[PDB]
């Protein structure tokens, strides 16, 4: 009646040419009393609908490349492309139309694999212009890095923050393969006004410690201000 | 030339209704076996199923919408539409139309229409302010905030367009607040920082509103970095 689908991995990292396998089980059987199991493959590349790749399990759509191939016993059914190409990257879906309502696995994103790289990191006080109208966003960036799994910390005169930063990460960029993020921290002047060092410390693979930038408000030297 | 296209996008109140449209060409909607689906995809919830109306007009509903939606279908221009009533922001998605193509393809969805994004949405239509992320291995990383907008999208460029190398452009957030907020950042030669002008061009055609805000360097700078490797 309400099949859940279980799609695994979330995300799979694969090198160009190499074989890629991904799995969908569904919480109970998904033959129809028919006796025809509908469990279909659907890709979706980056600004794209949704493509049919495979249908009634292990059948080829037409035009879909036979590195392409599905199979399924029981409740475990398994998407296999021989050799995985450039244009085979995107998100891969499983569905089953064979009991309403049917019903969508959750995705799998294939990307590109490729060698750790540790992120440039950048920090920047808010605007003198942002300041007037009664705020400040504080903006960290981390740029060109691999694998995406970054930590990123807001410290406030050594005070973790936490609920006041939202993070925004880009899609793999299509030359190198890497990815940038930016985190921002933002407060009412009142309160940024109140405290002196704003810091975000980076946790990545690519480096050895985590690193920090941070600088110290009402600063940029002066002896006599401003 | 079997094709499914949809209307256009759609922003609207919470508690308010949204018709959206699916006309189909190259085949006979009427052909035995064949059907429409409607599908939605958001941003961290996949696809799920909505609705699915038959070629003898039979239609047939997901319980998660609590009976908010009706499918019609008026043969004349072989067009589906997907009445959804009552919105919430939860509703925010896309929505996609796509064919169940019959018995000869085991019902699976070959054609898909390209989408109609709906945003639910109290916020009125509203330009963005521009701020400026100041300059600070002789490389230097510099950009724009872009802030408390709506709706989607904004386009950003770097002087003209003539700056396109280590450009990135964030994807936008949704503040609590009900606004988008968004960074573009760019890294260049420290050494440019003096005698190179650096403008970022905000566009966003919904409120029809054109900024260009000049980043200039910061005069002095004490940012520290400790760790690392």
């Known amino acids: 009646k309400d099949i859940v689908m279980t799609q695994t991995p979330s995300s799979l990292p694969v090198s160009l040419g190499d074989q890629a396998s991904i799995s969908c089980r569904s919480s109970?059987?998904?033959?129809?009393?028919?006796?025809?199991?509908?469990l279909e493959w659907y890709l979706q590349k980056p600004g794209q609908s949704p493509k049919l790749l495979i249908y009634?399990?292990?059948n080829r759509f037409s035009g879909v490349p036979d590195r392409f191939s599905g199979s399924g016993s029981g409740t475990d059914f398994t998407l296999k492309i021989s050799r995985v190409e450039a244009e085979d990257l995107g998100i891969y879906y499983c569905?089953?139309?064979?009991?309403?309502?049917?019903?969508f696995g959750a995705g799998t994103k294939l990307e590109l694999k490729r060698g750790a790289a540790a992120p440039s990191v950048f920090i920047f006080p808010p605007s003198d212009e942002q300041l007037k109208s009664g705020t400040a966003s504080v903006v960290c960036l981390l740029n060109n890095f691999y694998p995406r799994e970054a930590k990123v910390q807001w410290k406030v005169d050594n005070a973790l923050q936490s609920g006041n930063s939202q993070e925004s990460v880009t899609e793999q960029d299509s030359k190198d393969s890497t990815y940038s993020l930016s985190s921002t921290l933002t407060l009412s002047k009142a309160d940024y006004e109140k405290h002196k060092v704003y810091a975000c410390e980076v946790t990545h693979q690519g480096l050895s410690s985590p690193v920090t930038k941070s600088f110290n408000r009402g600063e940029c030297h002066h002896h006599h201000h401003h | 030339q079997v094709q499914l296209q949809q209307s256009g996008p759609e922003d609207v109140k919470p508690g308010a209704s949204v018709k959206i449209s699916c006309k189909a060409s190259?085949?006979?909607?009427?052909?035995?076996?064949?059907?429409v689906n409607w599908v939605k995809q958001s941003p961290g919830k996949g696809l799920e199923w909505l609705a699915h109306?038959?070629?003898?007009?039979?239609?047939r509903y997901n319980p998660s919408l609590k009976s908010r939606a009706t499918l019609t279908v008026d043969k004349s221009s072989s067009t589906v539409y997907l009445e959804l009533r009552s919105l919430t922001s939860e509703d925010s998605s896309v929505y996609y139309c796509?064919?169940?193509?019959?018995?000869?393809?085991?019902?699976?969805?070959?054609?898909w229409g390209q989408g109609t994004t709906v945003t639910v949405s109290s916020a009125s239509f509203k330009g963005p302010s521009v701020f400026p992320l100041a300059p600070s291995g002789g490389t230097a990383a510099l950009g724009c905030l872009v802030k408390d907008y709506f709706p989607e999208p904004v386009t950003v460029s770097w002087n003209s367009g003539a700056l396109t190398s280590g450009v990135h452009t964030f994807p936008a957030v949704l503040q609590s607040s009900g606004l988008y907020s968004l960074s573009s950042v760019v890294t260049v030669p420290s050494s440019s920082l003096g005698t190179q002008t650096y403008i970022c061009n905000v566009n966003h055609k919904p409120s029809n509103t054109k900024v260009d805000k000049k980043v200039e360097p910061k005069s002095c700078d004490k940012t520290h970095t400790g760790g690392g490797g």
């Open positions: 796509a064919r169940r193509g019959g018995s000869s393809h085991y019902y699976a969805m070959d054609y």
């Open positions: 190259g085949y006979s909607l009427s052909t035995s076996g064949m059907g």
């Open positions: 109306i038959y070629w003898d007009d039979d239609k």
């Open positions: 109970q059987s998904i033959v129809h009393s028919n006796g025809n199991t509908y």
């Open positions: 009634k399990v292990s």
């Open positions: 569905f089953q139309g064979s009991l309403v309502p049917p019903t």
